[PDB]
Curated annotation (Swiss-Prot), chain C:
It comes from Homo sapiens (Human). The gene is KCND2. The lineage of its organism: Eukaryota, Metazoa, Chordata, Craniata, Vertebrata. This is A-type voltage-gated potassium channel KCND2. Voltage-gated potassium channel that mediates transmembrane potassium transport in excitable membranes, primarily in the brain. Mediates the major part of the dendritic A-type current I(SA) in brain neurons. This current is activated at membrane potentials that are below the threshold for action potentials. K(+) binds at T32, L33, G34, Y35. The chain holds residues 339 to 388 of 630 of the full protein. Belongs to the potassium channel family. D (Shal) (TC 1.A.1.2) subfamily. Kv4.2/KCND2 sub-subfamily.
Amino acid sequence: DIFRHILNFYRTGKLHYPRHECISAYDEELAFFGLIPEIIGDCCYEEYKDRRRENAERLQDDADTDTAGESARQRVWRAFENPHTSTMALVFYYVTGFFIAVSVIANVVETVPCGSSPGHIKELRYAVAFFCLDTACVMIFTVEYLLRLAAAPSRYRFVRSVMSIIDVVAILPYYIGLVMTDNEDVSGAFVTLRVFRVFRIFKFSRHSQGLRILGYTLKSCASELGFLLFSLTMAIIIFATVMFYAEKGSSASKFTSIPAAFWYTIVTMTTLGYGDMVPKTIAGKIFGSICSLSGVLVIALPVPVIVSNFSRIYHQNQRADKRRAQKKARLARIRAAK
Amino acid sequence: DIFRHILNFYRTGKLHYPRHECISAYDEELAFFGLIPEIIGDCCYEEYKDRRRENAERLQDDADTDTAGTMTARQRVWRAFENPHTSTMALVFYYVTGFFIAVSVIANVVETVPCGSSPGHIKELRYAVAFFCLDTACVMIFTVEYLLRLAAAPSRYRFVRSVMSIIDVVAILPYYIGLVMTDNEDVSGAFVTLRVFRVFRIFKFSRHSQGLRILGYTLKSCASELGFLLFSLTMAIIIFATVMFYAEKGSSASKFTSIPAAFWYTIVTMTTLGYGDMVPKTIAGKIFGSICSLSGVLVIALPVPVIVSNFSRIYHQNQRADKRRAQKKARLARIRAA
Amino acid sequence: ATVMFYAEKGSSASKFTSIPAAFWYTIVTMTTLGYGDMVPKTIAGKIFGS
Amino acid sequence: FVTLRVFRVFRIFKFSRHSQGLRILGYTLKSCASELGFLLFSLTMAIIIFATVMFYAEKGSSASKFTSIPAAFWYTIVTMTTLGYGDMVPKTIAGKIFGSICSLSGVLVIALPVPVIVSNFSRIYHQNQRADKRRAQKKARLARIRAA
Amino acid sequence: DIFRHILNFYRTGKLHYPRHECISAYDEELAFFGLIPEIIGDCCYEEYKD
């Protein structure tokens, strides 16, 4: 059947690719017959290249099936980074997740009125022991990183990873607070450091598969996110300027300056509508409605490609385990079926 | 045609499956030639695999023949009213109990308006407790069906294990618990809680609906997606609430008392609801509220298309199944007609 | 609406006078409209509103 | 003078040179003129109908803000877009029912042409990317066919 | 090409419908050859009807 295509090619000087003969059957024939794969039509060339690519993404994951087969601090590192190895890795995974959960819930509770300054002014409870808990969690986290400091086959390669930078930036706040307390006490960046303290949630990227795939999707669609941001800035600037210039004349209009118009426009384009700032002139109302419509449009512009990329990556990642299992079953079955 | 692929297999160590021809003839040829089916390439292998599970999916329900022609036993009339179209008694029972459920729910909703069950007259003569009687008039009837369901239950254990049965139990129980409590004198508190389940009584409508069962099926299938939705939503709530609260602790009349208030603000902002009860005041607060709104749009819209697609495909496959069952019955009728 | 009324009928001057008011609030919430006329004030109210 | 100052932000569209998304959006808006016109027509029809129903059901109240039909236009356009500022709100039972149905109908009307616009933009972007990628791949094909 | 499908049908007792031969070419052949259009497979019957 492919020889017929070669005959047609020699007849006309241009070759075409059968659609129902696939590529791993076409490639073998074109290699055996010695044909040139860069003269196969124009439209057929493109569709053949696309199909070659489509069948090409599955030649490396099956190659990556073996993963790591090396054993020893390397062996314990392999058991650690992949929890589904032994009881030890499961124990550390579970306990680390539990302690991250207790740290974040403690940070949440830190300002609960029963657990904070209010609720007791007439007589005095405000247990400061929260502090100690934080300390414990922090050092435990550092112990984690300490093994990551040693078990990593390459120090620089591990540090370059985003997981390492997240871990270290969540480690810093406790030590920075200790250093600040060591040298007197000044108001200011202490609340800011407490703000950075919340970033400890991100360790669940290890205790999940959805967080890392979501990060993958966001990193892949960076151009579309930038287009979102640019178009949104254009729209907010235009609509805020128009509404300010059509509403600055009023009794006590909340549109004091352009940034107030930014606030109103960004709460409108997102269809939020707090009601703090509303127009009072006809031009104000009409441009507010147009702004809401344009905000719906702008926000809905890139979400289809975002959700499509997320879905595609999720299908491939979730089916990785499935076709791995069925290849394993086929491999077990084949050598006894001959 | 298939002999060509067979000869291609005997040419090398690999075989390929064309995408157009049906799988049935191909597996028939594989069986007749004595060829193993786990040797048909790798890409073509998985393509054949998905085609074969697709064609087995349309074949598993093809055996819907046991539902053919109060004639055999008690279980026979049980199955007769299980399908509310077999007999006149089944349909009348189904629709009449649907009307009873509807009137029960109407009584439940109307028992609080200040014209029929609350004093709209401080000194005049209505607050009829007849709803109770009506309620009892419903409750007894309700219990009836459950006993009827247990009158001819083919498997008591499996039927009790069913979600439909436990829904029925949770629907009928609260009145029994309330009357037992009244038999053991009246205490304020959980009485409103027992009254709440009077609207969980609604799920009896799942019999009188096809969409509800499909929604339950797709929610059961998409448990992982819902769990990831919950996890990512909680993470976003915590992060944005902490950032908002720590940036709004001090103001003239700040409503951000503590972290739970920031949870309320973050969940009314990400859902694009925007009640306006608590609003940001500082520039950092406004910026972080805006980014919270956009991120909430993203997070909410991440799993919703997945849920929607799963529901749509389940509905479509159900419709395809019933339509092809009807068409195969018609095919049998016309093949016996000539 | 029933859940929010039974979790919010106890308040100082709660606008949830009767179940139809809870219908109004619920239908302005499920549509993500949020006029702000009626808002919960108890923890159960807030969680069930979300 | 303020009107002349306004166009200082219409000056922004000079960024269309420094952007590919803006040109694609312009192309798809030009292609989908009929869809946008039907959007406008159906939206105006819904505005008129729901505003009339709301206003005629809310003329008389203690402190009703529905002074006239344009106020009902404002309410209908803040309700259909699921914005809900809260400046003017229904008070009567018929008013609440019609506000609810207005909100649902506005969701429907807004979501009718938006997927069409989105699909047209996506297909235009995809065909542009396919065109430039295949131009690059045919240049590479020429380079390798001259290499041997 | 459709005669080959008829041959396979007589070989096995069950007929299948080619996917690239369309229907207004399949219908004429099945009418000229007098085949029964209600024995053409099970999955193939459904896809042919669609």
